Coordinates of C-alpha atoms (C1' of nucleotides) in Angstrom, one line a residue:
Chain A
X60 CA -24.3 -14.5 25.4
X61 CA -21.4 -11.9 26.5
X62 CA -23.4 -9.4 27.6
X63 CA -21.0 -6.6 26.8
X64 CA -21.2 -4.5 23.4
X65 CA -17.7 -2.9 22.3
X66 CA -17.2 0.7 21.9
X67 CA -16.3 1.9 19.0
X68 CA -13.3 4.2 19.3
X69 CA -12.7 5.6 15.1
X70 CA -14.5 6.6 12.1
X71 CA -12.3 6.6 9.1
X72 CA -14.6 8.3 6.4
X73 CA -14.0 9.6 3.2
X74 CA -15.6 12.3 1.1
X75 CA -15.4 13.9 -1.8
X76 CA -16.8 17.6 -3.1
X77 CA -16.4 16.8 -7.5
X78 CA -14.4 19.9 -7.4
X79 CA -10.7 21.3 -7.4
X80 CA -9.1 23.3 -4.5
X81 CA -6.4 25.7 -3.9
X82 CA -4.6 23.8 -0.7
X83 CA -2.4 27.0 -0.4
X84 CA -5.5 29.6 0.0
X85 CA -7.5 26.8 2.3
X86 CA -4.5 27.0 4.6
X87 CA -4.5 30.7 4.8
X88 CA -8.1 31.7 5.1
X89 CA -9.0 28.5 7.2
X90 CA -9.0 28.7 11.0
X91 CA -7.1 25.6 12.4
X92 CA -5.3 24.5 9.1
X93 CA -1.3 22.8 8.2
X94 CA -0.1 22.7 5.0
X95 CA 3.1 21.4 4.6
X96 CA 3.2 20.2 1.0
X97 CA 6.9 19.1 1.8
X98 CA 5.9 16.2 3.6
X99 CA 2.2 15.3 2.7
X100 CA 0.6 16.3 -0.2
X101 CA -2.8 17.5 1.6
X102 CA -3.7 20.5 4.5
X103 CA -4.9 18.8 7.9
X104 CA -7.6 20.8 9.3
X105 CA -9.3 20.2 12.6
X106 CA -12.3 21.0 14.5
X107 CA -13.6 21.2 18.2
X108 CA -17.0 20.4 19.0
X109 CA -17.1 16.7 17.0
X110 CA -13.3 16.6 17.3
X111 CA -12.5 15.2 14.1
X112 CA -9.4 15.6 11.6
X113 CA -9.8 15.8 7.9
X114 CA -7.0 15.6 5.3
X115 CA -8.4 17.7 2.6
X116 CA -6.3 16.9 -0.9
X117 CA -5.9 19.0 -4.2
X118 CA -8.3 17.0 -6.3
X119 CA -11.7 17.5 -3.7
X120 CA -11.1 14.4 -1.6
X121 CA -11.6 14.3 2.0
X122 CA -10.9 12.3 4.3
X123 CA -12.2 12.3 7.8
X124 CA -11.0 10.3 10.8
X125 CA -11.6 10.4 14.9
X126 CA -15.4 10.4 14.7
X127 CA -16.9 8.1 17.5
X128 CA -20.1 7.4 15.9
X129 CA -21.8 7.2 12.5
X130 CA -23.6 10.0 12.0
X131 CA -21.0 12.3 13.9
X132 CA -18.6 11.9 11.1
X133 CA -21.1 13.2 8.8
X134 CA -21.8 16.2 11.0
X135 CA -18.0 16.4 11.0
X136 CA -17.6 16.1 7.2
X137 CA -20.7 18.2 6.5
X138 CA -19.0 21.0 8.7
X139 CA -15.6 20.8 6.6
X140 CA -17.2 21.0 3.6
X141 CA -19.1 24.3 4.4
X142 CA -15.9 25.5 5.9
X143 CA -14.9 25.4 2.1
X144 CA -18.3 27.1 0.9
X145 CA -17.7 30.0 2.8
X146 CA -14.0 30.2 1.4
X147 CA -15.8 30.3 -1.8
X148 CA -14.2 27.2 -3.5
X149 CA -17.3 25.6 -5.1
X150 CA -17.9 22.6 -2.2
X151 CA -20.6 20.0 -2.9
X152 CA -21.5 17.4 -0.3
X153 CA -21.1 14.3 -2.2
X154 CA -21.1 10.4 -2.0
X155 CA -19.8 9.2 1.9
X156 CA -18.6 6.3 2.4
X157 CA -17.5 4.7 5.8
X158 CA -13.7 2.9 5.0
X159 CA -13.0 2.2 8.0
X160 CA -14.2 1.3 12.0
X161 CA -12.2 0.8 15.0
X162 CA -13.9 -0.5 18.6
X163 CA -12.4 -1.7 21.4
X164 CA -13.5 -3.2 24.3
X165 CA -12.2 -5.9 27.5
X166 CA -13.6 -9.7 27.8
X167 CA -12.5 -9.3 32.3
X168 CA -10.5 -12.0 32.2
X169 CA -6.8 -13.0 31.1
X170 CA -6.3 -15.1 28.3
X171 CA -3.6 -17.4 27.0
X172 CA -1.9 -15.9 23.9
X173 CA 0.2 -19.2 23.7
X174 CA -3.0 -21.0 22.8
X175 CA -4.4 -19.3 20.3
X176 CA -1.5 -19.3 18.5
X177 CA -1.7 -23.0 18.7
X178 CA -5.1 -24.0 18.4
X179 CA -5.9 -21.3 15.5
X180 CA -2.8 -20.9 13.5
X181 CA -3.9 -20.6 10.1
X182 CA -5.6 -17.1 11.2
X183 CA -3.7 -15.9 14.4
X184 CA 0.4 -15.3 14.1
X185 CA 2.1 -14.3 17.1
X186 CA 5.3 -12.8 17.9
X187 CA 5.6 -11.6 21.0
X188 CA 8.7 -10.2 20.4
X189 CA 7.9 -7.1 17.7
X190 CA 4.4 -7.1 19.7
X191 CA 2.7 -8.1 22.6
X192 CA -0.5 -8.9 21.1
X193 CA -1.9 -11.6 19.3
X194 CA -3.2 -10.7 15.2
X195 CA -6.0 -12.5 14.6
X196 CA -7.3 -12.5 10.8
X197 CA -11.3 -13.3 11.4
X198 CA -12.5 -14.5 7.5
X199 CA -16.2 -13.9 8.1
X200 CA -16.3 -10.7 8.5
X201 CA -13.2 -10.2 7.1
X202 CA -11.8 -8.2 10.4
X203 CA -8.1 -8.2 12.1
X204 CA -8.7 -8.3 16.1
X205 CA -5.5 -7.5 18.3
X206 CA -5.4 -9.9 21.2
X207 CA -3.9 -9.0 24.7
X208 CA -2.8 -10.7 27.7
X209 CA -4.7 -8.3 30.1
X210 CA -8.1 -9.2 28.3
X211 CA -8.2 -6.5 26.0
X212 CA -9.3 -6.8 22.2
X213 CA -9.3 -4.3 20.0
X214 CA -11.4 -5.0 17.0
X215 CA -10.5 -3.3 13.3
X216 CA -11.2 -3.3 9.9
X217 CA -15.3 -2.7 9.3
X218 CA -17.4 -0.8 7.4
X219 CA -20.3 -1.0 9.5
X220 CA -21.4 -1.2 12.9
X221 CA -23.1 -4.4 12.5
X222 CA -19.8 -6.5 11.4
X223 CA -17.9 -5.3 14.6
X224 CA -20.3 -6.5 16.4
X225 CA -20.7 -9.9 14.6
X226 CA -17.1 -10.6 14.8
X227 CA -17.0 -10.4 18.9
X228 CA -19.5 -12.6 19.4
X229 CA -18.0 -15.0 16.6
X230 CA -14.7 -14.8 18.8
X231 CA -16.1 -14.5 22.4
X232 CA -16.5 -18.5 22.5
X233 CA -12.5 -19.2 21.6
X234 CA -11.2 -16.4 24.2
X235 CA -12.9 -18.2 26.9
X236 CA -11.6 -21.5 26.0
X237 CA -8.5 -19.9 26.8
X238 CA -8.9 -18.7 30.1
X239 CA -5.5 -18.5 32.2
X240 CA -5.9 -20.2 35.8
Chain B
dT1 C1' 98.7 -25.0 -96.8
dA2 C1' 96.8 -20.3 -94.0
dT3 C1' 93.7 -16.6 -92.1
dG4 C1' 88.6 -14.7 -91.6
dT5 C1' 83.8 -15.7 -90.5
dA6 C1' 80.1 -18.9 -89.5
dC7 C1' 77.9 -22.4 -86.8
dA8 C1' 77.3 -26.6 -83.2
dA9 C1' 79.0 -28.3 -79.1
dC10 C1' 79.8 -29.3 -73.9
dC11 C1' 41.3 -5.0 -33.7
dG12 C1' 37.8 -6.7 -31.2
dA13 C1' 34.9 -7.0 -26.9
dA14 C1' 34.0 -5.9 -22.2
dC15 C1' 32.2 -2.8 -18.5
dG16 C1' 29.8 1.4 -17.4
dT17 C1' 26.7 5.1 -17.7
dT18 C1' 22.5 7.2 -19.5
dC19 C1' 17.9 6.9 -21.2
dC20 C1' 11.6 4.4 -21.5
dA21 C1' 8.7 2.0 -19.1
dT22 C1' 5.6 -0.4 -15.6
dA23 C1' 4.9 -1.3 -10.7
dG24 C1' 5.8 -0.3 -5.6
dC25 C1' 6.9 2.2 -1.2
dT26 C1' 7.0 6.0 1.6
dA27 C1' 4.7 9.7 4.2
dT28 C1' 0.1 11.7 7.3
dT29 C1' -4.5 11.0 9.9
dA30 C1' -7.3 8.7 13.7
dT31 C1' -7.9 5.3 17.7
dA32 C1' -7.9 1.3 20.9
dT33 C1' -4.3 -1.4 23.0
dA34 C1' 0.8 -2.8 25.4
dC35 C1' 6.0 -4.0 25.4
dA36 C1' 10.7 -1.7 25.3
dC37 C1' 13.9 1.9 24.5
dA38 C1' 15.7 6.5 24.4
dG39 C1' 15.8 10.5 26.6
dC40 C1' 14.9 14.9 29.6
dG41 C1' 13.4 16.7 34.4
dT42 C1' 13.8 16.5 40.4
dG43 C1' 15.2 14.7 43.9
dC44 C1' 19.2 12.8 46.7
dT45 C1' 23.6 12.2 48.5

DNA sequence: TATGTACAACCGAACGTTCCATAGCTATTATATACACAGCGTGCT
């Protein structure tokens, strides 16, 4: 009905290697590594070809983020593991689970936020002197939507690409019902 | 009769400080979105 498909903007994927790393060694022998143990307990590393960031912890756990596609995250995570391998550490690609997907879109018309905040009060929270966007907590699929007056919708919380589409197709009608003017 | 001698009667407890045990908050990364606020820098007068 809508005819517009939301576009994914970020994918937070987590990977494990099953081995203990020495963060200082990784920071000193990796191209772009930023290890500051005083603030955080991981070495932050970036690569350019998929443009993703990785938080590599001392327990062999990795948190890749920034990929725009489900497969691109796999390529980024694989390259990060390979870089760790080329250092010499025992690193093997292992369980890869996408823990969060963020998508954005626009319905192309203003939305009366005061309406959703009133009609849908059990899901929507509208406190406009803190954040200019209404927060809709959909119950099935369990996804959080940020609805803005300019007609822009942000989808976050989906674990697969299907739920983020399902949420938008279920939110378009109630959004159109509250079109200003 | 007189004098001796004898006998009978008339400290607690309130508050403060240190020591285990469990759970929860804090910080960091990425991204779309948008508002308000606090800066910095450049032209104008």
